[PDB]
Design a protein around this ligand. Structure first.
Ligand SMILES: O=P(O)(O)OC[C@H]1O[C@](O)(CO)[C@@H](O)[C@@H]1O
Ligand SMILES: O=P(O)(O)OC[C@H]1O[C@](O)(CO)[C@@H](O)[C@@H]1O
Lengths: 557, 557
């Protein structure tokens, strides 16, 4: 077996679920206990806004929460957390520290890796970012024709793309005085082509973002950008005015031809999917200003301290993690929906697809044993209220159990029509979780059908279609306003949720060996596509698809 | 029980799965049979490009496919299809026909509802769309100050938003000479506010898209747009130059204040999530031109005829549906990933979230029986190659089985760098499904680690982490080019897949009762948010969340 399934607290939880989970009905839990909301929610005061984590609409009792907390303790969560924060090499397959918390360590308390405090270098790079942001935003940094920069283009993929994109989207109201920001990520030539079509080489600055600086998509895109730039500038020395790099790989950055002073460094203990807090966040700092970037870091730091100091039973990321374990390992739910009622947060779910799924989509434990249980869920979602008119039909009346996190700011960035739109948004946010919990009883639906003037025959037939079974669990995460600080806290909260789940599953949340095979096979196929010769080196499907490509690529439509 | 589970062909399939499915090994299936690709793929010649549906990397044999086709026959798929196409009222809970196929019926063969051919009215509205598009796109249509229209703004949600958005994104290269198109959908005031900030009332044309013309988000957004417009124009007669409606509800359109000559009608037998082919497609036709819109319809028509006339064993939407049933009802897979290797197709997955999940996220059958089996899956995905760097880790090395559809055009719209980007894109498309199929055996990983110079201790530690179990099934859908015609064919193909699955499950793919409760409860909460008084009328969570909103909404941040 595996560490989790051999754990007696887990076995107790699973046995309790088998015997008792059918007795858990949300409607009944609330009716029996008027203090339920009070006892199953956390109202966090950050001193820069409140974050309410309301987990009361979950299929849990006091006893279940107790069993879950006991499991976190007996799986070593507290010790593992302390090991992360102290610079222990908890990324055990790669023998690396895991120190995204150092990037936003506003206290500047020493954090050592190999006996050396990492904070001076973290702060050196942050200082460099601040100076660069001043130069660019002020207009002092000139392009090759002497004009101020108006557009920033981040080129990167995965962890070097999703964070900066999601955060600049979420913090758009804070971007006054900043350059426009663009994100090129896909190797698909459409991406860079459509981006470059709208830009001038005179006023565009490219940020080449890559931890390794060897990712094929990013380097190829970067080289395409450089070719486009040099077509207009016709001067290799002008590249230094229009290209900067964010990387750990000094040598590869030099090889590409980027100025050493134009390199913003980070470290191997910064995972790509945990990197927006580092040099990788340069496009964020350029767009919304360095002050707002520091606020983002500070919010994350607040949540780091919350995670570090708080007893597990009232520790927000721990509780979210534990509810997830309950649904994944006891109920068997494959997915987790993230439903932000905020258009600015439209890339939040996509971000946590990498954050969660690349971290915990794993099957080998620390001992080398294969898991004999589920690990990370499939994360998905779209902003409310849009989702209500897309897929909530299935959440309400399908055959799947889907834990959902509903998120919303109390205060909107755009209080148009004296707050009318936000009133409606909030009402929908509240009503949907209420609806998911309560459902609609046959007696309720029957009266509605009767009042609608339905015949006895029509009523009979329609009735079951109009019933909502309910008992569908949700979290509601409500916060004062989506400021840089609060966004930072929210992202950090989910980072630590993911960490806790990984520890409980005994997996490594911080490596990504599962991307290797696809990369290897793509390197083999690339040269085979050129020319007219038949490819026979693969299975018949791969060969057949290549044959189709070669036959169809010259056809004129 | 329910129709599917009571069906003897289904029980035979399920029994076969229990006894034999563990013996299906993709790597071995391909090695043993060089004809596998040929026997498990469909190369469709539309005369306007080819669509290759390669389903050979699925966990199926000849026997499995035979059983699935027999099940489709036993479930009356052909008769149900014919009934849809003939105008029978197969939406039985609403007593409506289901006739998105009539919208693109290029043959003009009569299709009757209530004894009356619907084609004359379909074509009348199409002619109106054509005339309007010519007037706007030519610059002839002038705004209230006498300027040509530069911006089109679609206001709508769900079925009145997702189709037009997805298609205008996918067909962006075909939009030269067309006005800019914007989509406003969320009630969240951010959506309309940030859109209006970039527009002039003099040169903006609003399209109010709503089947019912009573949806709160859409009517509120429309009223906000009208107020903004009238603040500038100060003349109610000017509204007729700047607002058009796409609806079935003439009375409510008139009540809003839109001219009857500015209404583009559709019909009750056009489902919202099947509506882009109707008047709802006006923003598509305006953006890319009516000719390209007609090509889109024509592509769908081709696929309709394929679905109608082809034996089930060679019928693309039927086979895709059956493979889906195999994974959903025999393997128990909750999800289905759509992974287009095309940046222009970045909203394709979101579109089929509504199309699939709102259609088949159901639990009551035609007999009135509650299903005792799974219905529609959770649909999700992001375009390749981005997904590879976000969540493919989980697909390769997680604990979930996830059927994936990989899609790509052979010809790119942007063959930059002499085709280099598209070469790399294609290589990744091919490699990923190869990798998912093949995996990497412990002995294969061992040899790789030994070659890398790893010590016996280092090798043994890393080995299990480097193993890929493989046997992960995919479809590869490859097409000559993503033209309007081919896109139309692809969308229709999935529409019919969804139809076939719904018939087999004995559910109604065409209603959506599951959205009612959320709407009702939101109407109740709306007025309660007004004022400072505490709300005690709900469960303690809803009450508590409302208390938090009221306490937090005045804080300065
Ligand atoms: O076009 P309407 O009538 O405004 O409806 C919008 C959407 O809301 C729904 O009725 C409910 O999700 C969808 O079916 C529809 O597409
Ligand atoms: O920043 P890099 O080195 O270009 O890597 C990009 C992405 O590719 C991965 O290494 C593999 O998906 C991610 O972890 C990472 O975020």
């Amino acid at each position: 077996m595996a560490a989790l399934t051999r754990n007696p607290q887990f076995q107790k939880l699973l046995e309790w679920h088998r015997a008792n989970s059918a007795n858990l009905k949300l409607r009944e839990l609330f009716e029996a206990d008027p203090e339920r909301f009070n006892n199953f929610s956390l109202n966090l005061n950050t001193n820069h806004g409140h974050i309410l984590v309301d987990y009361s609409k979950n299929l849990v009792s006091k006893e279940v929460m107790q069993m879950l907390v006991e499991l976190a303790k007996s799986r070593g969560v507290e010790a593992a957390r302390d090991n992360m924060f102290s610079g222990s090499k908890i990324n055990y397959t790669e023998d690396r520290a895991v120190l995204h918390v150092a990037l936003r360590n506003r206290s500047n308390t020493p954090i050592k890796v190999d006996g050396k405090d990492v904070m001076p270098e973290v702060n050196r790079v942050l200082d460099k970012m601040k100076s660069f942001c001043q130069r660019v935003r002020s207009g002092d940094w000139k392009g090759y024709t002497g004009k101020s920069i108006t557009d920033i283009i981040n080129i990167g993929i995965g962890g070097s793309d999703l964070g900066p994109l999601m955060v600049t989207e979420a913090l758009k109201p804070y971007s006054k005085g900043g350059p426009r920001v663009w994100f090129v990520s896909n190797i698909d030539g459409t991406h860079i082509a459509k981006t470059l079509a709208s830009l001038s080489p005179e006023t565009s600055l490219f940020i080449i973002a890559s931890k390794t600086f060897t990712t094929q998509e990013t380097i190829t895109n970067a080289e395409t950008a450089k070719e486009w730039f040099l077509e207009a500038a016709k001067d290799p020395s002008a590249v230094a005015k229009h290209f900067v790099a964010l990387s750990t790989n000094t040598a590869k950055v030099k090889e590409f031809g980027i100025d050493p002073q134009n390199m913003f460094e980070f470290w191997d203990w910064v995972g790509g999917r945990y990197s927006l807090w580092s040099a990788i966040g340069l496009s964020i700092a350029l767009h919304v200003g360095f002050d707002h970037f520091e606020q983002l870091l500070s919010g994350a730091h607040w949540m780091d301290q919350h995670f570090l100091k708080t007893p597990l039973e009232k520790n927000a990321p721990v509780l979210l993690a534990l509810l997830g374990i309950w649904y994944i390992n006891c109920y068997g739910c494959e997915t987790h929906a993230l439903l932000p009622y905020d258009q600015y947060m439209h890339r939040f779910a996509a971000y946590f697809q990498q954050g969660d799924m690349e971290s915990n989509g794993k099957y080998i434990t620390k001992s080398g044993a294969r898991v004999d249980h589920q690990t990370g869920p499939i994360v998905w979602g779209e902003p409310g209220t849009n989702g209500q008119h897309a897929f909530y039909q299935l959440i309400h009346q399908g055959t799947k159990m889907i834990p959902c996190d509903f998120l919303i700011p109390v205060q909107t960035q755009h209080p148009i029509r004296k707050g009318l739109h936000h009133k409606i948004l909030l009402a929908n946010f509240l009503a949907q979780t209420e609806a998911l919990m309560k459902g609609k009883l046959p007696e309720e639906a029957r009266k509605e059908l009767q009042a609608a003037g339905k015949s006895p025959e029509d009523l009979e037939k329609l009735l079951p279609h109009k019933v909502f079974e309910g008992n569908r669990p949700t979290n509601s995460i409500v916060f004062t306003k989506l400021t840089p600080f609060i966004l930072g806290a929210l992202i950090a909260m989910y980072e630590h949720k993911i960490f806790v789940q990984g520890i409980m599953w005994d997996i490594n949340s911080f490596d990504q060996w599962g991307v290797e095979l696809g990369k290897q096979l793509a390197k083999k196929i690339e040269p085979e596509l050129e020319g007219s010769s038949a490819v026979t080196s693969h299975d018949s499907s791969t060969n057949g698809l290549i044959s189709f490509i070669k036959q169809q690529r010259d056809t004129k439509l």
